[PDB]
């Protein structure tokens, strides 16, 4: 009924790429102020397409992993509080968790990105921070119960009887998953190795340095300040040398 | 007909290359099917024909894993059958609920789940039997010892699970499909995973320790290495943590320079056929021209 | 404060016996335990944070250089609490 | 008597346990794609 | 009384916390498409 006229617009480069995305807005703007003042102002600016659908993707992927990460950190620092009866472990372990997936993800860029010239593709930082939080919430949890159940023998034994026992477990744990996760580098499609050895790579940083030195670390530095809204003492009441055998 | 991203647009794209592949060009004339709803197709058809290799390099992997961390046949067997008695209940379970139409699934939500379930089902299963050879080694019997491994460890592995689950349904709050389609499917699956992991594991553990020596511990100064560490930790914490922050700090400087990309040709063997479609195309318009964008202009009268 | 010898001894080679493994009937006064006992730098470390921590005996981490033998150890203890 | 409920009524009842999750996952498993 | 709201403060940060990522999480999930 001739209500409606369409144009078909190709670009020059990718299509998919930053720019051919952000050259969508650019598009309806041109085509906006392009009846403006004309006997068309007013009419509705339609704009459907591949790089149109992949803006709005980028948008709101955008929005997507900040619900997600808000949910997932108050989940975390939740089940930290109701195990340890403490603010200051379950905000320590929140923190740590931020900054280990923080330097996971760095990591990973700097080895595709800057190194193989590949870019991430769009979904592997989604992808990768899912799974990442959700080993990361086992291991903190199963390191820090053991630690709240032995520091009655004073934080710093409470500390190596921890260690001894549950980082070995821990660290069996992370480098079993990690090392299932990178062997997706021999898939053809490159999507998949990205994700796997984002994922591989981002639980080797944490078993091996931030879990296995940086949070007890943390544990042994805030000596009894660790376990705060509970009074804990940093070591017993001195014991006499006991008798022979 | 369909619609990008679901079944039924693929049903489309192959009808039409059975279509214009039935019948034959004149000669020198070559035909394709380019197109960003036939590189889905081929792009999901080829991502099965990955993954069942995927399925299997995983699997040759995880067994000199546990090879290298129980050094034992036995105990790698036992562990093993149950992460994989996990993972199939897992399948079987977010199938059955997915197939009565009583949730939404995706072919997206289920190669996450599988990952999920398995990342879970190792953990869950090498605490387990991580605190019991410890209690064991401590001199406990076998008795005293699988007390110890629950009273320490069924309430980490309930807790974690249960947030994970909690976290993953959280999903179901975001917008797009792909997320979104995320949240019941693997919450149910993180549930399923943890109530095996917490029967089934310990049933496992109860039933296989009442013969000869079969779960009992063999790597044990591992222990004591980890002890030293830990005695290294506890005596010069400022030091350590400095050097652990430092050494985040080099992957945390790189994150202002992440670039992402959406062409999903980039990420994709140049040898599906839509690939190629692309480059024969690419060979006589430019890149661009596969892809073309469509502006409508809507007026209230006759424009002709 | 007299804990006599064989005391010390004895609170030591409980330390030791969890830490390392090492019977207490082996933990003698003239043993050393970079050779007779072979315990290393970083397991000192770790029996000397344990003793700090159940007797509340600190020793800096100069002085545990120098505690090569189990009767050194006592020696110290000893001349610590003799305070 | 002294073991508490859960993991004691998991070790007795531990073949029937191991029993009915086989049970379950082949029904999970044939009656369903 | 503050007595008795300290025998109950693992809830009550709990519901704070719960309240603001709610809160948060609904405002957020506006963005998109608007
Ligand atoms: C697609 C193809 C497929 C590919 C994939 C598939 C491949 C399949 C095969 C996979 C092969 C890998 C196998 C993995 C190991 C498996 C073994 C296992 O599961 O556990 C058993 C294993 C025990 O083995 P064991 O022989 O039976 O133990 C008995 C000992 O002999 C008896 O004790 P000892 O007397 O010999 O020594 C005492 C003690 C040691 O005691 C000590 O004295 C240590 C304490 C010293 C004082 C403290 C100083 C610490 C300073 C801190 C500074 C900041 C932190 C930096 C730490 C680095 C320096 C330590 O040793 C220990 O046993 C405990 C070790 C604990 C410390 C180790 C912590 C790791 C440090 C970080 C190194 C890597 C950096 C991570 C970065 C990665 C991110 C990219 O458990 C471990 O020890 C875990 C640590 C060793 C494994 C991790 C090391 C790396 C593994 C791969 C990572 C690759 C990194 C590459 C980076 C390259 C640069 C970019
Ligand atoms: C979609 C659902 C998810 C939504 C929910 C989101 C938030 C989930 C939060 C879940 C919190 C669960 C709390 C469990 C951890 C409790 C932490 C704690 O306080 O530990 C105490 C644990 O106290 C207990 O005794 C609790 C024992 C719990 C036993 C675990 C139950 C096993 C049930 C087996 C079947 C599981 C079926 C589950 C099906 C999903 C410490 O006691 P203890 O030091 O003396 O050591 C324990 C020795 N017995
Ligand atoms: C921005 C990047 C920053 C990286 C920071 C990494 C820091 C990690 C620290 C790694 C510590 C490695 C284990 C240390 C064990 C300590 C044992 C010890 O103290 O004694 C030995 C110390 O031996 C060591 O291993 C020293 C540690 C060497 C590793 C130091 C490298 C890590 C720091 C890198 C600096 C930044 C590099 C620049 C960016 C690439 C004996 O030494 P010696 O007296 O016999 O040697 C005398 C011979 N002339
Ligand atoms: C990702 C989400 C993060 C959001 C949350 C961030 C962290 C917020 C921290 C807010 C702290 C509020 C908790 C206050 C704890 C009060 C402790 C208490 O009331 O009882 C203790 C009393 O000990 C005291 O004396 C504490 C008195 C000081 C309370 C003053 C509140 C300080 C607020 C700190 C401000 C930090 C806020 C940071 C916000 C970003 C001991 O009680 P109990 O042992 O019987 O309970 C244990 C068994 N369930
Ligand atoms: C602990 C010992 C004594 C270990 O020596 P043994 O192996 O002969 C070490 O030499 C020492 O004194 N200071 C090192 C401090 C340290 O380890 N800091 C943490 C590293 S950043």
């Known amino acids: 009924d001739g209500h409606a006229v369409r144009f078909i617009i190709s670009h020059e480069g990718d299509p998919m790429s930053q720019a051919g995305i952000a050259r969508i807005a650019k598009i309806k703007t041109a085509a906006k102020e392009a009846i403006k003042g004309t006997p068309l102002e007013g009419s509705a600016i339609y704009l459907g397409g591949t790089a149109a659908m992949f803006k709005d993707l980028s948008d709101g992927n955008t929005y997507d992993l900040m619900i997600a990460g808000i949910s997932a950190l108050c989940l975390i620092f939740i089940i930290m509080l109701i195990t340890t009866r403490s603010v200051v472990a379950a905000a320590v372990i929140v923190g740590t968790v931020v900054l280990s997936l923080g330097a996971s993800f ?126 804990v003492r940093q070591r017993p009441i001195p014991q006499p040398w006991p008798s022979p055998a | 007909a369909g619609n990008q991203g679901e079944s039924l647009a693929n049903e489309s794209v192959e009808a039409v290359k059975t279509i214009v592949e039935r019948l034959a060009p004149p000669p020198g004339v070559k035909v394709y099917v380019t197109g960003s709803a036939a590189l889905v197709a081929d792009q999901q058809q080829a991502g099965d024909r990955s993954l069942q290799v995927i399925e299997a390099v995983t699997f040759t992997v995880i067994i000199v894993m546990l090879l290298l961390v129980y050094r034992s046949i036995i105990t790698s067997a036992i562990m093993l059958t149950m992460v994989v008695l996990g993972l199939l209940a897992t399948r079987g379970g977010v199938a059955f609920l997915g197939f009565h139409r009583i949730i939404g699934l995706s072919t997206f939500a289920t190669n996450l789940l599988v990952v999920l379930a398995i990342a879970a089902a190792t953990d869950y299963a090498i605490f387990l039997i991580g605190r019991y050879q410890e209690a064991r080694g401590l001199g406990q019997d076998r008795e005293s010892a699988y007390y110890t491994m629950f009273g320490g460890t069924a309430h980490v592995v309930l807790g974690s699970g249960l947030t994970i689950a909690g976290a993953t349904f959280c999903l179901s709050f975001t917008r797009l499909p792909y997320f979104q389609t995320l949240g019941v499917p693997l919450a149910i699956g993180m549930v399923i995973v943890v109530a095996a992991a917490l029967t089934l594991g310990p049933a496992i553990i109860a039933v296989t320790s009442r013969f000869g020596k079969l779960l009992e511990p063999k790597r044990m100064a591992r222990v004591r290495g980890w002890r030293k560490v830990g005695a290294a930790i506890v005596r010069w914490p400022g030091p350590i943590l400095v050097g652990a922050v430092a050494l985040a700090l080099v992957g945390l400087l790189t994150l202002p320079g992440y670039r992402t990309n959406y062409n999903d040709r980039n990420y994709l063997p140049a040898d599906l056929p839509a690939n190629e479609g692309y480059a024969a195309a690419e060979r006589h318009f430019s890149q661009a021209r596969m892809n073309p964008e469509v502006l409508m202009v809507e007026s209230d009268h006759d424009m002709r | 404060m007299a804990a006599t010898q064989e005391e010390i001894i004895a609170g030591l080679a409980e330390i030791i016996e969890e830490v390392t493994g090492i019977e207490p009937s082996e933990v003698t006064p003239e043993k050393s335990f970079v050779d007779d006992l072979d315990i290393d730098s970083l397991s000192m470390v770790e029996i000397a944070v344990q003793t700090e921590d159940k007797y509340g005996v600190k020793i800096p981490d100069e002085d545990l250089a120098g505690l090569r033998t189990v009767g050194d150890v006592v020696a110290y203890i000893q001349k610590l609490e003799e305070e | 008597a002294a073991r508490p409920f859960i993991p004691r009524m998991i070790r007795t009842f531990a073949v029937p346990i191991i029993l009915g999750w086989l049970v379950t996952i082949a029904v999970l498993n044939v009656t369903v794609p | 009384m503050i007595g008795t709201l300290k025998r109950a403060w693992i809830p009550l940060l709990i519901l704070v916390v719960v309240a603001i990522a709610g809160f948060t999480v609904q405002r957020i999930r506006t963005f998109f498409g608007s």
Request: glycine share 10%.
């Open chain 1, 106 to 231: 760095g990591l990973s860029v700097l080895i595709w990105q800057h190194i193989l010239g590949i870019e991430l593709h769009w979904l592997v930082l989604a992808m990768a921070v899912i799974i990442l939080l959700a080993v990361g919430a086992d291991y903190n949890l199963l390191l820090v119960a053991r630690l709240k159940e032995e520091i009655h023998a004073g934080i710093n034994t409470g500390i190596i009887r921890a260690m001894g026992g549950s980082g070995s477990v821990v660290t069996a744990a992370g480098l079993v998953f990690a090392f299932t996760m990178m062997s997706f580098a021999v898939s053809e499609l490159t999507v998949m190795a990205q994700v796997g050895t984002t994922i591989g790579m981002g639980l080797l940083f944490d078993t091996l340095i931030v879990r296995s030195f940086m949070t007890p670390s943390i544990a042994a530095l805030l000596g009894k300040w660790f376990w705060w809204p509970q009074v």
